[PDB]
């Protein structure tokens, strides 16, 4: 099904103004963002969601700064970007679930502090 | 638990305005799309439109765009469906439902539905006429009432077997007509007493009609 | 708009048999299809989403399959609480649409209707209107033709009818046809009859009465 060039974990420090959690699908065949549905999970909660069919991003209030670059979706890039204030109290394992046309897969990335 | 409670049934006249509501509870109301579905009597489901209570982002179906207004209020977790000028064709059951956070945009939770009736008629109590009779049949004709519904029992609920209360029909006068029948042994027509208990709550009418040969 | 067409319109099957409901789309929806069931007087109930994924609390007898255009809802063993109307819904493109719907009715042995005719009461005649009622009781299948004959003349456009839902016990239907006439027109004739045509009848059953 869907494949990723997965990463074990990413680290950020005090110098990190914003953090970026990587998520790259290697075998995407979607030609339109309307065929893509991306959901980022943290501790069993949808902390980010991209509805391709409705072209809208959805975030809870504790992840107000969480967003992805939509223009990079069709290239397989579904990396999540947020500010340090939202990442400080949210260290742990993030799940990047990507729904692409007929196929669906997910990968787990860990966000740790140093 | 997730719950969507809608406003009560509405009986309006053509040309009047109407605003029905739907309050969500047991979940973050501002993080899920709310859809409105119309189901005309004896017809299929019609997706009217959706709204995201977070920023009041509204999407309408082409068949309902300009015909209706969808809004929401974050302060009380309530979605609204509003008309400016009702038509008789607006007579339907309206459901509010939560759009699941999935690629299929399915509706996981539904409201109880809001029955909206639109016609030029007014509230009127029914006239009950008897339907005099091995197996014999008898009943009563509940004619010329408005609006729906009407409840019919027999012998104060002591008789349920063979009882058939047919769906009402809308006559040309805009008034409803209903028939309720029951099959009883022909040998019981001489002794057993059969009473038609008709109750019309909208007009506060209670009629007990004795049916005999 | 992506049009969803369901087939067939009505499925008459016996309790225990399996049901195969189809759903065709005007274009590819890419598994983004959902299935619902609806019982009379109740809101729709989510069964399947993502074409094949069952919802929480949904029996294993319900199954989903298909991708792109052709889709299928499958019910392995029909239970009495499974006979209702089923809808399909796509969520790939806005506006989201539903199917026309497919009703699953219980199939039983053919039963002929018991026909009864009712003359208008003297109470109603005093008001100035006459309603003649023809009753069809407990029959199967649902298809039934009722014709009103007044003085051996076929009537048209002056009658209304309504049919009950499928009975919970014997799984039959009942029909009530009402002939509405004014008091003046009712007093112009003598013979009032209703001619019933049904599959369980080798000959059209005619119940009648003479005014007076
Ligand atoms: C999804 O919505 C966004 C805007 O919410 C669109 O992104 C850009 O919007 C600006 C503003 O009009 C345009 O100038 C750009 O051309 C849009 N594209 C990009 C890549 O920036 C985006 O077009 C929408 N996609 C749809 C409707 O499928
Ligand atoms: C995120 O998930 C990974 C793997 O599922 C967890 O990795 C384990 O981390 C503990 C921490 O003490 C180690 O002792 C184990 O050896 C690790 N197991 C593996 C298979 O790598 C990680 O702990 C999770 N992160 C959090 C914050 O719980
Ligand atoms: C996946 O990551 C690898 C890292 O070596 C990179 O070479 C490759 O271009 C990536 N694939 C994508 C995102 O197309
Ligand atoms: C933090 O900044 C460093 C600076 O190069 C970067 O390498 C690292 O990826 C950043 N951390 C995150 C989580 O983005
Ligand atoms: C994706 O589809 C939409 C319509 O659904 C269209 O407006 C848009 O141009 C398409 N994108 C591309 C890259 O073709």
Author numbering:
A (entry chain C): 1 to 114
B (entry chain H): 1 to 133, 141 to 220
C (entry chain L): 1 to 212
Paper text:
CD47, also known as integrin-associated protein, is a ubiquitously expressed 50 kDa cell surface transmembrane Ig superfamily member. CD47 interacts with integrins (for example, αvβ3, αIIbβ3, and α2β1), thrombospondin-1, and serves as a ligand for signal regulatory protein alpha (SIRPα).1 Due to its multiple interaction partners, CD47 mediates a variety of biological processes, including leukocyte adhesion and migration, T-cell activation, apoptosis and phagocytosis. Studies with erythrocytes, platelets and leukocytes identified the CD47-SIRPα interaction as a negative regulator of phagocytosis. Therefore, therapeutic targeting of CD47 may have widespread application in numerous cancers, as overexpression of CD47 may allow cancer cells to co-opt CD47-SIRPα signaling and evade phagocytosis-mediated elimination.
On the basis of the desired characteristics, such as potent SIRPα-blocking activity, cross-reactivity to cyno CD47, and lack of induction of hemagglutination, we identified two mAbs, namely C47B116 (hybridoma derived) and C47B91 (phage derived), for further optimization via human framework adaptation (HFA) and affinity maturation (AM), respectively. C47B157 and C47B161, derived from C47B116, and C47B222, derived from C47B91, were selected as lead candidates for further evaluation. These mAbs showed potent SIRPα-blocking activity, good binding affinity to both human and cyno CD47 (1–4 nM), and did not induce hemagglutination or platelet aggregation. The detailed atomic interactions of C47B161, C47B222 and B6H12.2 with the human CD47 extracellular domain were determined using crystal structures of Fab/CD47 complexes. The epitope regions that overlap with the SIRPα binding site are located in the β-sheet and loop regions of CD47. Specifically, the CD47 regions of overlap for each antibody are: C47B161: residues Q1, N27, E29, E97, and L101-E104; C47B222: residues E35, Y37, K39, D46, T49, T99, L101 and T102; B6H12.2: residues E29, Q31, T34, E35, Y37, K39, D46, E97 and T99-E104. To characterize the role of Fc function on the activity of anti-CD47 antibodies, three lead mAbs, IgG2σ C47B157, C47B161 and C47B222, were converted to an effector function competent human IgG1 Fc format and were evaluated in vitro and subsequently in vivo. With respect to the IgG2σ-based mAbs, C47B222 demonstrated the most consistent anti-leukemic activity in vivo. Collectively, blocking CD47 in the absence of effector function, did not result in efficient clearance of AML disease and did not provide a survival advantage, while effector function competent IgG1 C47B222-(CHO) demonstrated anti-leukemic efficacy. Although effector function competent anti-CD47 mAbs, such as IgG1 C47B222-(CHO), demonstrate promising efficacy, a non-human primate study conducted with IgG1 and IgG2σ C47B222-(CHO) revealed that tolerability of anti-CD47 mAbs may be limited by effector function.
